[PDB]
Amino acid sequence: SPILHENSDLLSKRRRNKFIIPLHISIEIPVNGIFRRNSILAYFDDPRYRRKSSGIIKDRFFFIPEEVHILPGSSSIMVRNNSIVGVDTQITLNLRSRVGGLVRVERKKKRIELKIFSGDIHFPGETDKISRHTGVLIPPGTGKRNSKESKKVKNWIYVQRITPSKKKFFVLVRPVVTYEITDGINLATLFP
Amino acid sequence: EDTNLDELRRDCGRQPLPRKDPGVKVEEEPLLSNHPYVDKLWQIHNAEQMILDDMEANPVKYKGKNLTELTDDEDFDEENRIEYSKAYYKKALLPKMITKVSVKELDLEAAFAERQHHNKLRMEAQERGEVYKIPKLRRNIEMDEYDFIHWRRSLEE
Amino acid sequence: EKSKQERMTDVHNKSIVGKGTVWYEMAYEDAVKERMQ
Amino acid sequence: KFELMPPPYPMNALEPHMSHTTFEYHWGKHHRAYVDNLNKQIDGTELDGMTLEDIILITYNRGDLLPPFNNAAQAWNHQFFWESMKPSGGGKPSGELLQLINRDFGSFEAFVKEFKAAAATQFGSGWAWLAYKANRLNVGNTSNPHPTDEDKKLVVVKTPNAVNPLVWDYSPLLTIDVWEHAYYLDFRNRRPDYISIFMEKLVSWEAVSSRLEVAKAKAAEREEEEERKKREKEE
C-alpha cells in the first residue's frame, strides 16, 4: 500500500515519446484513452489561491470582499435600503451582519438580494471631482518620511462613489485583496 | 528457403533494394543520450524498493522476513507474467501489462540496509519537523552511470 | 472537423467551464527551474 | 595579397640533408603558383581581406568544398609546415609536452614510433598532423554532463590532399608534407627513411611547445567566453 514518505517523482521516469506517471493534482482520460493536440489531462486547482469571501478578484488582481445575503421574497428584512448598519446588525430573524457598511437591498422577482458593502464612509469636498459611476482603486502611496504623523497606508483601497440621493453623494473606501498572476507557481514534481 | 531479400542481394551481386530518400542530413542531428539497460533498472530500483518497503512499512510484514532471501512466489515465471489486461475500469477500460520481477533478481538485503540509514535520516527529519526529502539514491546515481557511457558513444562516432 | 478539436474542446470545457483568460502559462521544465531557483 | 613569406630559416644553405634545389622547387615554385592563383581567384572577392584561416574555413564550405579552399589550405599548410622545421634542433622535447606524452602515448618514444606509422597511412598526397582537442560540439546534446579534465587529448590524424584540422576544429600543432614533391628528390620514394630523419634531425620541438601554449591559451579563452555566456544567461 502507501507509505509515509510519498514522493511520486522518485517513482516516475520520462522517456522519449513516453511519459509514465504512477497513479496514487488529478488527471482524467477520455473514454477512448485518446488524447489530442492541446488536450488537458491534468487539473491543478490550488486551494492556496482560493478565497472564502464572496468578493472575487477582477499582473495583479484586486479582490473587494462584500457581504451578500440571498434571501427569499417572503423573508422579512430588518434593515432598510441604503442604510448604514454596524457590526452584528440583525438583518433577519436569524441572520446577523458580519461586517459593517452600507446595506443595499435588491428586490428581484422571486429573490431578495441584500448586499453589505463594508468600508469607511467619507464625504468628498467640492474640489473632489471623483468619477461617480467609475470606481477607482488607489495603490499604496509612497508617503514622505519627513511627516511623522503621516500614517502610511500599506494596503490598497478601493474607492467607490455611492449616490443614494440625486443631490447628496458619498465615497466608500472598500477593502482590497492581492491576487498576482506572475507571483505564485506551485506544482508537484511529476517526472524525476 | 530464403526469407531475407537483403541476404539474397549479397550472394547474387545485385544492387540494394531501394528505400525512399530521407530529407534530413545526419551531418547535423541531435545526439542520442538514453540507455537500453536503463529500462531494467528503473523497473528494478523501484522493484527492489517496493518489496523492501512492504516489509519496512509493516511490522507484521517485517516479522518472519529475511532480507537476504525472499520469494515473491513459489512458481512465478517472468515470461508467464507478461500480459495485457483491459478488465479494470476504475478510471477507464484499457490494457494493463504485468511484469514479474524475479525475487532472486532483486537485491533486497542491500536495499534494506540502505533503507535503515534512510529511515534514520527520516527520523532526524521528523525531529526537525521538516518532511524528509532525498534527492538521489545510489540506484538513481547508477542510472546516470550506465547512461553515461552512451554519451561518449555518440560522441565518439 | 471530426471532432479533431471539437472533442478535445468538449473535454476542455469540462475541465474549464468558464472561458477564462489564461493568467499563467508555463512549461514543466520552466516550472522546475523556477522551483530550483 | 596574402603573405608570400620569405622562408623563416636560412633555408638554402640551412641543412645538408635537405637540398637547396629541393627547397627552391618546394617554396620557390609551389608557393609562387599557389599565391598568384590564390590572388588571382581572390580578385574582386568579398572574401578577400579575411585571414587565411578565415578564407580556408570559408571555402571549405562545410559539406561542399567550394572553389577556393584548395589553394588556401595548401598555402597555409605549407607555411605551418614550415614552422615545424628547425635549423638542426630536435629530440626529447620536454615541458608541458613530456607530461602530456606519458599521459597519452606513454613515452616520447612511443609517440615517435606511433608517428612513424603515418608513412603508411597516406597512400598519396597529404599531410600528417599532431593536434589539440579544443573541439566545439555543434549540435543537439552538445554539452557534456559530468564535465571533467583529461577531456583534452593530443591527437594524431591523417589528412588527404588539402585538409587542415581547423576544418574540424582540432588545434594543429605539427605537420609533414607527404606529397611526393617534398621528399622525392632527396630519396626516391624512400618515405620510411625520410620520415625518421625529419622526426629526429630537424623538427623545432620548441616551436611545437610554443604552439601548445598558444592552444592552451585559446582553450582558456573559449572557456572564459563560455563563462561569459553563462553569466549572460543568468542575468
Curated annotation (Swiss-Prot), chain A:
Domain of life of the organism encoding this protein: Eukaryota
Localization terms from the record: Plastid, Chloroplast
Quaternary structure and partners: In plastids the minimal PEP RNA polymerase catalytic core is composed of four subunits: alpha, beta, beta', and beta''. When a (nuclear-encoded) sigma factor is associated with the core the holoenzyme is formed, which can initiate transcription.
Stated family: Belongs to the RNA polymerase beta' chain family. RpoC2 subfamily.
Protein role: DNA-dependent RNA polymerase catalyzes the transcription of DNA into RNA using the four ribonucleoside triphosphates as substrates.
Protein name: DNA-directed RNA polymerase subunit beta''
